[PDB]
Amino acid sequence: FPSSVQIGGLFIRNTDQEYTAFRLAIFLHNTSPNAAPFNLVPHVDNIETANSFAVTNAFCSQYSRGVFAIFGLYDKRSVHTLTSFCSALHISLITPSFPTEGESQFVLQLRPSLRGALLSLLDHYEWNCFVFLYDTDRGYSILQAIMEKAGQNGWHVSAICVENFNDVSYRQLLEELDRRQEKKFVIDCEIERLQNILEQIVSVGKHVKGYHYIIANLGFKDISLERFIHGGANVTGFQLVDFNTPMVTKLMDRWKKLDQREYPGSETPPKYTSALTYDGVLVMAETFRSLRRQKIDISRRGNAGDCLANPAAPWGQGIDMERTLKQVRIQGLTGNVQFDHYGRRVNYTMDVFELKSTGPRKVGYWNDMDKLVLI
Amino acid sequence: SIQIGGLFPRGADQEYSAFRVGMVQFSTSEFRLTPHIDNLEVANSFAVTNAFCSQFSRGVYAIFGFYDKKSVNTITSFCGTLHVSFITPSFPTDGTHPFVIQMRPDLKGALLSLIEYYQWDKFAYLYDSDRGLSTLQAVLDSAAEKKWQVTAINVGNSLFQDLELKKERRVILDCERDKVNDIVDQVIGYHYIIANLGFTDGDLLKIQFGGANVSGFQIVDYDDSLVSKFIERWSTLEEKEYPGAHTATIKYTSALTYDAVQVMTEAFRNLRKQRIEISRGDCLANPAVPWGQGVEIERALKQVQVEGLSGNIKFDQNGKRINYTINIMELKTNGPRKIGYWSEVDKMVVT
Ligand SMILES: *[C@@H]1O[C@H](CO)[C@@H](O)[C@H](O)[C@H]1NC(C)=O
Numbered sequence: 001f002p003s004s005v006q007i008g009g010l011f012i013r014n015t016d017q018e019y020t021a022f023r024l025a026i027f028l029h030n031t032s033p034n035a036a037p038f039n040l041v042p043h044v045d046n047i048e049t050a051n052s053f054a055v056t057n058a059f060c061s062q063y064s065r066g067v068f069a070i071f072g073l074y075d076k077r078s079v080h081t082l083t084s085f086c087s088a089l090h091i092s093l094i095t096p097s098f099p100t101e102g103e104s105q106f107v108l109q110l111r112p113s114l115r116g117a118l119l120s121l122l123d124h125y126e127w128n129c130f131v132f133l134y135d136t137d138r139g140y141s142i143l144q145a146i147m148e149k150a151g152q153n154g155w156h157v158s159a160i161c162v163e164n165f166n167d168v169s170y171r172q173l174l175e176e177l178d179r180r181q182e183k184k185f186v187i188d189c190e191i192e193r194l195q196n197i198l199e200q201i202v203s204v205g206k207h208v209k210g211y212h213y214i215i216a217n218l219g220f221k222d223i224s225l226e227r228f229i230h231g232g233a234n235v236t237g238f239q240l241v242d243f244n245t246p247m248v249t250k251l252m253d254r255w256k257k258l259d260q261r262e263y264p265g266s267e268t269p270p271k272y273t274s275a276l277t278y279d280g281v282l283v284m285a286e287t288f289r290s291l292r293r294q295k296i297d298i299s300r301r302g303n304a305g306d307c308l309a310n311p312a313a314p315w316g317q318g319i320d321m322e323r324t325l326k327q328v329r330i331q332g333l334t335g336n337v338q339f340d341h342y343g344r345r346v347n348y349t350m351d352v353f354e355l356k357s358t359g360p361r362k363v364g365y366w367n368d369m370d371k372l373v374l375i
Numbered sequence: 376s377i378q379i380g381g382l383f384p385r386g387a388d389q390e391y392s393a394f395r396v397g398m399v400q401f402s403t404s405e406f407r408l409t410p411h412i413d414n415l416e417v418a419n420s421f422a423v424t425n426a427f428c429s430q431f432s433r434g435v436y437a438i439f440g441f442y443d444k445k446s447v448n449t450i451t452s453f454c455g456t457l458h459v460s461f462i463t464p465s466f467p468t469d470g471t472h473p474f475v476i477q478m479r480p481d482l483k484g485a486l487l488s489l490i491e492y493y494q495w496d497k498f499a500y501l502y503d504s505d506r507g508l509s510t511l512q513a514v515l516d517s518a519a520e521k522k523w524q525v526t527a528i529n530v531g532n533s534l535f536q537d538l539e540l541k542k543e544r545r546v547i548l549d550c551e552r553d554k555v556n557d558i559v560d561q562v563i564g565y566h567y568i569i570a571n572l573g574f575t576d577g578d579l580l581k582i583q584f585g586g587a588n589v590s591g592f593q594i595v596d597y598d599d600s601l602v603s604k605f606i607e608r609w610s611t612l613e614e615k616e617y618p619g620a621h622t623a624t625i626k627y628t629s630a631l632t633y634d635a636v637q638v639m640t641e642a643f644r645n646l647r648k649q650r651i652e653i654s655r656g657d658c659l660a661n662p663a664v665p666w667g668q669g670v671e672i673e674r675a676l677k678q679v680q681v682e683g684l685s686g687n688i689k690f691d692q693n694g695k696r697i698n699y700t701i702n703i704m705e706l707k708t709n710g711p712r713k714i715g716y717w718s719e720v721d722k723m724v725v726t
């Protein structure tokens with residue numbers, strides 16, 4: 001089998017730390033002594049503002065260099081082009097980006113859904129009347145789950161899409177929800193928008209005893225929550241990456257010693273997306289390893305490597321690449337990593353964290369099969 | 376003579392018949408307008424990208440076509456980056472996107488205005504994950520503002536018994552048309568608002584509803600001269616020769632296709648009358664180099680103002696219809712009748 005294995009890396013705007021985590025996972029693999037060995041050789045494009053034109057260029061450039069798989073990120077503007085070219089051409093996508101519920105061939109989604117976790121929490125707290133503040137940046141899957149469970153179980157929901165809100169609109173909205181005696185909230189937003197809302201909640205003085213916030217994010221620990229600690233509003237969230245396992249700790253010993261100029265973003269600990277990104281590299285490694293144990297000499301000679309070729313010429317061995325990827329089962333910074341036939345994370349787990357005066361404390365954890373098991 | 380692209384869905388036979396008839400109607404010999412057709416699954420971004428790229432390669436000056444929610448970014452990004460104008464009857468994007476000429480009127484404001492007209496505060500909203508959730512967001516945002524009690528069930532990938540216990544008397548249907556029939560059945564007194572622009576476009580009347588009230592919207596007004604004149608030709612075309620023709624009606628998307636042809640054609644007559652010449656392709660070139668006369672074509676398209684099957688046709692600077700009328704319709708025992716209109720400045724109007 002060959003000494004190198006060729007992959008794509010496709011990163012978007014504001015992904016320094018993720019790219020750091022990708023470069024490290026590939027460096028340590030390429031220099032590991034651990035006991036059919038190979039070097040991972042990346043071909044990288046960072047496309048700034050992510051849009052279908054830029055994502056097709058990057059893809060086609062990487063498809064023409066002979067990559068067998070592409071580690072890639074997307075947003076709502078590029079997800080469908082990138083998944084659609086991958087599934088057309090039989091190149092697999094390994095991605096930390098937001099999951100979709102429908103409908104994935106050739107796409108391997110490291111990021112687990114927050115849907116199940118989020119709905120079991122609303123049950124436990126017995127939430128009837130609440131506001132759902134959201135944006136469409138990671139799709140509509142959460143919003144549908146919520147408005148269906150409102151209909152199914154007879155709740156009341158104030159569901160507002162906060163995309164394109166300026167800062168008064170938040171205060172104006174929080175004022176109007178003040179007058180309706182609205183105290184309980186689920187917020188489900190992209191991180192930059194979350195931080196802003198949290199500032200706005202504070203300005204209004206709604207960060208105190210009485211008020212409740214469930215934050216649909218996978219890195220509760222990375223949210224700066226000082227004024228809510230003091231104010232005394234009850235705030236709950238999730239945390240995928242469990243720092244006290246020895247696998248994460250081992251990584252953190254390295255991460256702490258990294259040179260900040262080589263590896264920007266290593267000055268703070270890894271966000272859930274950075275941790276997924278390293279896990280992605282470990283999944284690509286395990287998969288090539290298992291293909292060699294299966295005795296399949298995958299290559300992309302002398303296939304044309306033009307992505308707009310008519311007739312479309314899918315990669316014949318792409319099928320085995322895909323099938324093996326979806327059977328992977330290994331441990332990573334995000335805990336046990338495996339997937340189902342449709343490529344989505346399964347048998348995964350994440351901690352539940354509650355904000356108290358001591359700071360954020362683990363009150364339990366949620367696993368997709370066992371559901372919520374409290375402490 | 377001007378070559379253009381056409382991107383049709385493979386099941387879109389009536390609309391291609393309306394396109395062919397428009398080409399004949401709107402020609403004069405002063406330039407040949409000459410279509411290049413591709414048929415394809417418009418849900419597939421890879422296929423749509425290929426088709427766009429074949430077209431750019433040959434030298435289309437504009438492209439007529441379609442998209443759905445999975446391919447809308449392919450189109451708007453490629454057209455936006457390369458400065459190729461796209462004219463379409465597909466669902467209009469929320470935001471602004473240069474080089475996109477949206478033939479289809481926005482339905483939301485008229486929908487919202489109609490709910491306020493009937494004074495509904497409780498209502499059930501049945502919606503479709505396959506078509507996109509753009510309108511459901513608008514109504515949920517308005518319900519939060521106006522303290523409406525909106526019970527919102529997905530029926531697009533029984534719901535019968537949940538309707539009863541929750542007990543919602545009004546219903547808004549924002550689904551594919553085939554499903555509309557099935558859902559009335561489960562329930563068989565009630566009130567229905569059909570959330571689309573062709574209330575009379577397929578099955579209706581004796582759907583049936585059991586004598587319920589039905590409201591809906593129509594952009595094509597068969598009392599107009601142009602429309603009844605058009606239908607006199609359409610209704611007598613040979614169906615073997617023009618599939619989906621030889622009928623008393625036309626689907627709204629087919630009417631917008633025929634209107635498209637007029638707008639493209641008028642935009643190019645404007646450039647000749649103003650003496651602006653246009654001449655003379657790689658999708659993946661780097662850096663991207665948009666063709667230089669594209670801006671002039673876009674500007675001419677948005678400056679078009681004509682009448683056609685969908686009423687007054689005019690665009691703002693972001694390619695969205697303005698100054699349109701949507702007729703408000705009810706199903707009377709006699710037949711679908713026009714109880715009024717939502718106009719683009721005056722909102723809902725009786726008589
Ligand atoms: C889930 O993972 C656990 C280890 O965390 C393991 O014991 C169990 O077999 C897994 N369940 C599956 C694959 O169904």
Ligand SMILES: *[C@@H]1O[C@H](CO)[C@@H](O)[C@H](O)[C@H]1NC(C)=O
Binds near residue numbers: 680687698
């Ligand atoms: C709006 O439409 C009417 C005809 O329907 C026309 O009289 C009016 O002038 C139009 N507005 C314009 C051209 O700004």
